[PDB]
Protein backbone atom coordinates (compact mmCIF):
# COMPACT_ATOMS: atom_id res chain seq x y z
CA UNK A 1 0.00 0.00 0.00
CA UNK A 2 0.99 3.42 -0.72
CA UNK A 3 -0.89 6.33 1.93
CA UNK A 4 0.68 3.94 4.69
CA UNK A 5 3.69 4.88 3.21
CA UNK A 6 3.51 8.25 3.22
CA UNK A 7 1.26 8.29 6.66
CA UNK A 8 4.55 6.30 8.30
CA UNK A 9 7.66 8.48 6.80
CA UNK A 10 5.67 11.53 7.97
CA UNK A 11 5.01 9.84 11.65
CA UNK A 12 8.81 9.27 11.28
CA UNK A 13 10.09 12.53 10.44
CA UNK A 14 8.76 13.57 13.75
CA UNK A 15 10.91 11.43 15.67
CA UNK A 16 13.92 12.67 12.96
CA UNK A 17 13.53 16.31 13.82
CA UNK A 18 13.16 15.56 17.69
CA UNK A 19 16.42 13.66 16.96
CA UNK A 20 17.97 16.46 15.30
CA UNK A 21 17.18 19.06 17.70
CA UNK A 22 18.32 16.81 20.80
CA UNK A 23 21.97 15.99 19.27
CA UNK A 24 22.67 19.81 17.97
CA UNK A 25 21.81 20.58 21.49
CA UNK A 26 24.15 18.14 22.98
CA UNK A 27 26.80 18.55 19.96
CA UNK A 28 26.43 22.28 20.76
CA UNK A 29 28.34 21.70 24.17
CA UNK A 30 31.21 20.09 22.33
CA UNK A 31 30.16 16.30 22.58
CA UNK A 32 31.67 14.97 19.72
CA UNK A 33 29.38 12.23 19.64
CA UNK A 34 26.16 13.59 18.85
CA UNK A 35 28.12 15.58 16.44
CA UNK A 36 28.35 12.14 14.10
CA UNK A 37 24.79 11.46 15.48
CA UNK A 38 23.21 14.77 14.19
CA UNK A 39 24.61 14.15 10.47
CA UNK A 40 23.34 10.48 10.93
CA UNK A 41 19.76 12.06 11.68
CA UNK A 42 20.02 14.49 9.24
CA UNK A 43 20.74 12.34 6.24
CA UNK A 44 17.87 10.36 7.38
CA UNK A 45 15.57 13.08 7.91
CA UNK A 46 16.66 14.30 4.32
CA UNK A 47 16.23 10.60 2.94
CA UNK A 48 12.27 10.58 4.15
CA UNK A 49 12.00 13.95 3.13
CA UNK A 50 12.85 13.28 -0.73
CA UNK A 51 11.35 10.18 -0.62
CA UNK A 52 8.11 11.68 0.52
CA UNK A 53 8.48 14.36 -2.09
CA UNK A 54 10.14 12.81 -5.39
CA UNK A 55 8.99 9.08 -4.22
CA UNK A 56 11.10 5.68 -3.72
CA UNK A 57 12.19 3.99 -6.58
CA UNK A 58 12.99 0.89 -4.05
CA UNK A 59 9.16 0.67 -2.74
CA UNK A 60 7.86 2.14 -6.21
CA UNK A 61 5.98 4.90 -3.98
CA UNK A 62 4.01 7.49 -6.17
CA UNK A 63 5.42 11.43 -6.20
CA UNK A 64 2.83 12.70 -3.40
CA UNK A 65 0.14 14.42 -5.36
CA UNK A 66 -1.24 18.12 -5.47
CA UNK A 67 -3.47 17.68 -2.72
CA UNK A 68 -1.10 17.81 -0.32
CA UNK A 69 1.36 20.63 -2.12
CA UNK A 70 -0.48 23.09 1.09
CA UNK A 71 0.77 21.17 3.97
CA UNK A 72 3.96 20.13 2.30
CA UNK A 73 4.83 23.48 1.25
CA UNK A 74 5.27 24.45 4.75
CA UNK A 75 7.30 22.22 6.54
CA UNK A 76 9.63 22.13 3.96
CA UNK A 77 10.12 26.37 4.83
CA UNK A 78 10.68 24.68 8.25
CA UNK A 79 13.14 21.91 7.30
CA UNK A 80 15.18 24.58 4.95
CA UNK A 81 15.75 25.96 8.32
CA UNK A 82 16.32 23.48 10.53
CA UNK A 83 19.17 21.64 7.51
CA UNK A 84 20.78 24.61 6.74
CA UNK A 85 21.85 25.49 10.36
CA UNK A 86 22.80 21.82 11.12
CA UNK A 87 25.11 21.93 8.19
CA UNK A 88 26.86 25.07 9.92
CA UNK A 89 27.08 22.70 13.01
CA UNK A 90 28.90 20.40 11.02
CA UNK A 91 30.60 22.88 9.39
CA UNK A 92 32.10 24.04 12.38
CA UNK A 93 32.73 20.08 14.66
CA UNK A 94 36.63 20.22 14.56
CA UNK A 95 36.58 24.09 15.81
CA UNK A 96 34.33 23.54 17.88
CA UNK A 97 36.30 20.27 19.72
CA UNK A 98 39.41 22.17 19.72
CA UNK A 99 38.10 25.01 21.82
CA UNK A 100 36.63 21.73 24.31
CA UNK A 101 39.82 20.32 24.36
CA UNK A 102 42.07 22.87 24.59
CA UNK A 103 40.04 24.70 27.52
CA UNK A 104 40.36 21.41 29.16
CA UNK A 105 43.89 21.48 28.36
CA UNK A 106 44.24 24.87 30.06
CA UNK A 107 41.66 23.71 33.05
CA UNK A 108 44.82 21.59 34.11
CA UNK A 109 47.67 23.97 33.43
CA UNK A 110 46.24 27.19 34.96
CA UNK A 111 45.70 25.77 38.26
CA UNK A 112 49.46 24.50 38.70
CA UNK A 113 50.39 27.84 37.60
CA UNK A 114 48.22 29.41 40.10
CA UNK A 115 49.23 27.93 43.36
CA UNK A 116 52.96 27.79 42.78
CA UNK A 117 52.89 31.71 42.58
CA UNK A 118 51.49 31.18 45.94
CA UNK A 119 54.50 29.49 46.72
CA UNK A 120 56.48 32.54 45.46
CA UNK A 121 54.66 34.68 47.70
CA UNK A 122 55.58 32.75 50.83
CA UNK A 123 58.91 32.79 49.47
CA UNK A 124 58.86 36.65 49.40
CA UNK A 125 57.64 36.28 52.56
CA UNK A 126 60.02 33.94 53.92
CA UNK A 127 63.21 36.14 52.84
CA UNK A 128 62.10 39.72 53.25
CA UNK A 129 60.48 41.60 50.19
CA UNK A 130 59.43 45.20 50.13
CA UNK A 131 55.25 44.50 50.42
CA UNK A 132 54.68 46.27 46.80
CA UNK A 133 56.38 42.84 45.60
CA UNK A 134 54.13 40.23 47.35
CA UNK A 135 51.46 42.09 46.76
CA UNK A 136 51.82 41.97 42.89
CA UNK A 137 52.15 38.21 43.04
CA UNK A 138 49.34 37.81 45.22
CA UNK A 139 47.46 39.86 41.95
CA UNK A 140 49.34 37.18 39.85
CA UNK A 141 47.95 34.53 42.04
CA UNK A 142 44.25 35.64 41.53
CA UNK A 143 44.56 37.18 38.17
CA UNK A 144 45.61 33.40 36.90
CA UNK A 145 42.25 31.99 39.39
CA UNK A 146 40.51 34.77 36.80
CA UNK A 147 41.85 33.11 33.79
CA UNK A 148 40.86 30.00 34.76
CA UNK A 149 37.19 30.68 35.56
CA UNK A 150 36.97 33.28 31.85
CA UNK A 151 38.23 29.51 30.11
CA UNK A 152 34.89 28.28 32.58
CA UNK A 153 32.88 31.03 31.28
CA UNK A 154 33.60 30.87 27.77
CA UNK A 155 32.51 27.17 27.23
CA UNK A 156 29.02 28.01 27.74
CA UNK A 157 28.58 29.44 24.26
CA UNK A 158 26.47 32.48 26.06
CA UNK A 159 26.85 36.02 25.23
CA UNK A 160 29.79 36.20 27.79
CA UNK A 161 31.95 33.35 25.99
CA UNK A 162 33.04 36.25 23.70
CA UNK A 163 33.42 38.67 26.60
CA UNK A 164 35.36 36.14 28.57
CA UNK A 165 37.57 35.26 25.91
CA UNK A 166 38.37 38.82 25.39
CA UNK A 167 39.27 38.82 29.04
CA UNK A 168 41.03 35.74 29.47
CA UNK A 169 43.51 36.95 26.26
CA UNK A 170 43.99 40.82 27.96
CA UNK A 171 44.29 38.89 31.94
CA UNK A 172 47.58 36.63 30.02
CA UNK A 173 48.47 39.64 28.21
CA UNK A 174 48.70 41.72 31.79
CA UNK A 175 49.58 38.21 33.10
CA UNK A 176 53.13 37.82 30.72
CA UNK A 177 53.51 42.09 31.14
CA UNK A 178 54.11 41.59 35.17
CA UNK A 179 55.36 37.72 34.86
CA UNK A 180 58.91 39.34 32.71
CA UNK A 181 59.07 42.21 34.84
CA UNK A 182 59.13 40.39 38.14
CA UNK A 183 61.75 38.32 36.10
CA UNK A 184 63.83 40.65 34.37
CA UNK A 185 64.16 44.56 35.19
CA UNK A 186 61.44 46.63 33.67
CA UNK A 187 60.06 49.99 34.00
CA UNK A 188 56.64 49.58 33.08
CA UNK A 189 54.36 50.01 36.52
CA UNK A 190 57.56 50.02 39.03
CA UNK A 191 57.84 46.20 38.89
CA UNK A 192 61.04 45.61 40.96
CA UNK A 193 63.13 42.52 39.69
CA UNK A 194 62.82 39.36 42.48
CA UNK A 195 65.87 38.67 43.91
CA UNK A 196 65.94 35.50 45.17
CA UNK A 197 66.90 32.70 43.80
CA UNK A 198 64.33 29.81 44.53
CA UNK A 199 61.66 32.25 43.64
CA UNK A 200 63.54 32.56 40.15
CA UNK A 201 63.87 29.30 39.73
CA UNK A 202 59.77 29.28 40.56
CA UNK A 203 59.34 32.14 37.70
CA UNK A 204 61.19 30.43 35.36
CA UNK A 205 58.87 27.34 35.92
CA UNK A 206 55.61 29.76 35.54
CA UNK A 207 57.15 30.91 32.63
CA UNK A 208 57.58 27.38 31.21
CA UNK A 209 54.04 26.92 32.15
CA UNK A 210 52.44 30.28 30.74
CA UNK A 211 53.61 29.13 27.58
CA UNK A 212 51.01 27.11 26.89
CA UNK A 213 48.39 29.75 27.84
CA UNK A 214 50.38 32.44 26.06
CA UNK A 215 50.28 30.43 22.61
CA UNK A 216 46.50 29.37 22.77
CA UNK A 217 45.38 33.02 23.65
CA UNK A 218 44.88 33.37 19.67
CA UNK A 219 43.29 30.18 19.14
CA UNK A 220 40.51 31.02 21.69
CA UNK A 221 39.93 34.32 20.45
CA UNK A 222 39.68 33.19 16.87
CA UNK A 223 36.82 30.33 17.88
CA UNK A 224 35.12 31.29 20.72
CA UNK A 225 32.66 32.90 18.41
CA UNK A 226 32.29 30.31 16.43
CA UNK A 227 30.92 28.16 19.19
CA UNK A 228 28.74 31.35 20.28
CA UNK A 229 26.82 30.79 16.83
CA UNK A 230 26.70 26.75 17.10
CA UNK A 231 24.82 27.79 20.77
CA UNK A 232 22.54 29.95 18.68
CA UNK A 233 22.09 27.44 15.77
CA UNK A 234 21.59 24.60 18.29
CA UNK A 235 18.33 26.55 20.22
CA UNK A 236 17.18 27.66 16.72
CA UNK A 237 17.54 24.22 15.67
CA UNK A 238 15.21 23.51 18.90
CA UNK A 239 12.71 26.01 18.38
CA UNK A 240 12.27 25.46 14.69
CA UNK A 241 11.58 21.66 15.37
CA UNK A 242 9.56 22.18 18.00
CA UNK A 243 7.47 24.10 14.92
CA UNK A 244 8.37 21.39 12.26
CA UNK A 245 6.43 18.60 14.91
CA UNK A 246 2.66 20.24 14.61
CA UNK A 247 4.04 21.15 11.26
CA UNK A 248 4.62 17.00 10.67
CA UNK A 249 1.52 15.97 12.40
CA UNK A 250 -0.79 18.46 10.63
CA UNK A 251 1.07 16.85 7.42
CA UNK A 252 0.38 13.25 8.67
CA UNK A 253 -3.20 14.00 9.38
CA UNK A 254 -4.25 15.70 6.13
CA UNK A 255 -2.47 12.12 4.48
CA UNK A 256 -5.02 10.53 6.57
CA UNK A 257 -8.24 12.79 6.14
CA UNK A 258 -6.92 12.01 2.17
Request: glycine fraction near 6%; aromatic fraction near 6%.
Amino acid sequence: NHDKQYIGHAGELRVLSQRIAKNATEAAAGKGEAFKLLKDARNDFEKRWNILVNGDESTSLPPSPEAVKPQMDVVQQDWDGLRKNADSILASEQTVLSLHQVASTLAETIPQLQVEYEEVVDILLENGAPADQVAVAQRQSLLAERILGSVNKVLAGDENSVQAADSFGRDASLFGRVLKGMQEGNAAMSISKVTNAEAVDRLNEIAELFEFVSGSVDEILETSPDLFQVREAANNIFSVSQTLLDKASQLADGFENL
